[PDB]
Amino acid sequence: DPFTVRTRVSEGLVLAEPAKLMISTDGSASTADLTRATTTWNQQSNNLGASSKYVTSVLMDAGNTGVITITYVADQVGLPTAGNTLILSPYINDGNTRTALATAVAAGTRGTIDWACTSASNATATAQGFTGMAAGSVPQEFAPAQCR
Numbered sequence: 345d346p347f348t349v350r351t352r353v354s355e356g357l358v359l360a361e362p363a364k365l366m367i368s369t370d371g372s373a374s375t376a377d378l379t380r381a382t383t384t385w386n387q388q389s390n391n392l393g394a395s396s397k398y399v400t401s402v403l404m405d406a407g408n409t410g411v412i413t414i415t416y417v418a419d420q421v422g423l424p425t426a427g428n429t430l431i432l433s434p435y436i437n438d439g440n441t442r443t444a445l446a447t448a449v450a451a452g453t454r455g456t457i458d459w460a461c462t463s464a465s466n467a468t469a470t471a472q473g474f475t476g477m478a479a480g481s482v483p484q485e486f487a488p489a490q491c492r
Contacts, residue, residue, distance in 0.1 A: 349486040352421045353430070356399040357461075357488060360414050360432055363393065363402055367410050367434055367445070368457040378449050379408045400428075409446040410434045411478065426481060430491055433460045433469075433477040444476055463487035 363385055371381030382404040386393050392401035400415040412432040418425050436448035438455035445457070460466075460474035463482040468490050484492050 346485050349422050350488055352398050353416065353423075353482060353486055354488045356396070356414060356416055356421075357430065357491075359394045359396065359399055360402050360412055363404060363412050364432060364434075364457075364459060367404075367412075371410060372434075372436070372445065372449060372454075372457060375408075375449050378410055378445070382406070382408045382410070407446075409444070410449075411445075413480070416482070423482060423486060427464065427483050427486075429463075429480040430482050430487065431460075431462045431478050431480040433462065433474070434458070435460070435474065442474065461488070461491040463491045465492050467492050 366381050366385055371378045385404050389395050394402040398417055398421050400417050402414050405411040414430045416423055416428040418428040434445040435442040435458045436445055436453055436455045437458045438453055442458060443453055460469035460477045462469050462477055463480045463484060465484040469477060
């Protein structure tokens with residue numbers, strides 16, 4: 345059932361929460377801190393970050409942009425072979441504007457972190473005012489509403 349698929353996609357999403365929080369508490373203060381968080385998170389779980397029966401990996405962008413990719417085990421969750429990722433993209437909110445984390449951190453721009461979640465479709469993230477972010481691949485009908 346597609347709704348069961350969303351729930352397992354949704355169950356898997358929870359596993360990325362600690363990666364988001366690490367980025368916000370310890371990985372945003374400086375360029376060096378963002379790289380440190382990336383290295384430390386990604387080394388977990390046999391270099392897969394976090395995993396489970398339904399989740400292959402939860403990984404931070406290797407180029408230190410702070411963008412998190414959740415990769416699902418397609419044949420256990422019931423997704424297409426290559427339809428299996430969600431993308432969480434961080435932005436510094438300085439109160440007035442949003443700036444992609446990688447850019448803000450390099451420039452020394454501080455603030456709170458907002459997250460865009462994208463799947464094969466970016467309706468929600470784009471509606472929320474996020475721009476610039478990569479596509480994930482989970483089909484819209486299986487993606488959590490906030491990732492559609």
